[PDB]
Amino acid sequence: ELHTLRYISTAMTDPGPGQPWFVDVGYVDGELFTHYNSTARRAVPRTEWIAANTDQQYWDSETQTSQRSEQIDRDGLGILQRRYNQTGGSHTVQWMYGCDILEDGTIRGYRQYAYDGRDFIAFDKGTMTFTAAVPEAVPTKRKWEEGDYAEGLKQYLEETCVEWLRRYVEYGKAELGRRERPEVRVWGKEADGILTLSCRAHGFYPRPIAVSWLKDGDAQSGGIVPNGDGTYHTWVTIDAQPGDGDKYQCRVEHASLPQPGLYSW
Amino acid sequence: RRREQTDY
Amino acid sequence: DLTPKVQVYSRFPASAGTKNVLNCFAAGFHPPKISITLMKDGVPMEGAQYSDMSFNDDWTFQRLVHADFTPSSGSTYACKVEHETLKEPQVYKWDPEF
């Protein structure tokens, strides 16, 4: 019942050889569904369901917004380097924005910026305020507090963003609402007089999962990481005494599983 | 749909 | 610490001679410039695909690299990561877990 629409953009002075310096992507319920970069200079679909339900004018419009955003960040990288008295080197602008539909029907919206990986400025739509995290952000705040910008941003976050999120989840309802069962493997290794038990869940969807080690009824988790195909992976290990392998069970909680799975080494 | 930013 | 946190894993629990996909996921790093290469026996694997540069709520960057492969017994598979925060290129071995 919770749905999320999130857009992020990165502007880099040093993306690496042959790499685009400006990259943006959009996510619906955590699934990547659109992308733009400064090399191809086109906003493109990244799921079947967005491509099937949009048209040429949609992608021309998204492309126009990204291209305009690209130019403003090209300017911004220079503006900020001059504000910071920087003359070269590796610098990055990042921003992310979007909206959430909460399980109670209430709506969240946000838009925030970072320079060189730390907070720069952020918008609070409910109060129409900007928080400048550093002094170099204050001249920006002064501009963004004037003109049409903040009322328009508030309206986008509360109305346009939510309206589009509702469209997208309808377009993608089949794929977004599916369940895929993880294939679980338990694996053990003994080194330095310690038995390390690994429990891996392969290829589950949706993202939320709980994997834990129970002893007889201090775990390290790699978090939830993506596969190439829209499914997810997690690994959880625990350190045990050698010979105690029989005492441990890996428990897997997932929406696709009517009852949690319990796996032995 | 995306929302452009404005001049820094 | 803005170093890449790296995990190597296959799409499916692996078995000898069975088609699979090898994944290298790096996350938590800054700046965004990074080199990530899937290796087989010290040699670049063919057909690698790279995620477009993305980042987490905490602003740190992440990238998935993946490539189709059929794991051979007696071969070693790994992911080599180069990043400004590292003193050496770092090699993360895939554990086939069979």
Author numbering:
A (entry chain A): 1 to 217, 223 to 270
B (entry chain C): 1 to 8
C (entry chain B): 1 to 98
Study text:
Compared to typical mammals which express multigene families of classical MHC class I molecules, in chickens only the BF2 molecule is well-expressed and is the major ligand for cytotoxic T lymphocytes, while the BF1 molecule acts as a ligand for natural killer (NK) cells and is relatively poorly expressed if at all. The overall structure of BF2*1901 retains the common characteristics of MHC class I molecules from other vertebrates including chickens: the extracellular region of the BF2*1901 heavy chain folds into three different domains; the α1 and α2 domains form a typical MHC I peptide binding groove (PBG), which contains two α-helices and eight β-strands; the RY8 or IL9 peptide lies along the PBG, as shown by well-determined electron density maps. In particular, the large residues Trp95, Arg111 and Tyr113 from the β-strands on the bottom of PBG of BF2*1901 are replaced by the much smaller Leu95, Ser111 and Asp113 in BF2*1501.
Moreover, in the M1 of BF2*1901/RY8, the hydrogen bond between P1-Arg of peptide RY8 and the Glu65 of BF2*1901 is 3.58 Å, while no interaction between them is observed in B19/RY8 M2 (not shown). When we superposed the structures of B19/RY8 and B15/RY8 according to the Cα of α1/α2 domains, we found that the position of PΩ-Tyr of peptide RY8 in B19/RY8 structure is higher compared to RY8 in B15/RY8 structure. The solvent-accessible surface area of PΩ-Tyr that is buried upon interface formation with the pocket F in BF2*1901 (246.94 Å2 for molecule 1 and 219.72 Å2 for molecule 2 in the asymmetric unit cell) is smaller than PΩ-Tyr in BF2*1501 structure (260.38 Å2). Thus, the B19-specific residues Trp95 and Tyr113 act like two bricks to bolster up the PΩ-Tyr of peptide RY8 in B19.
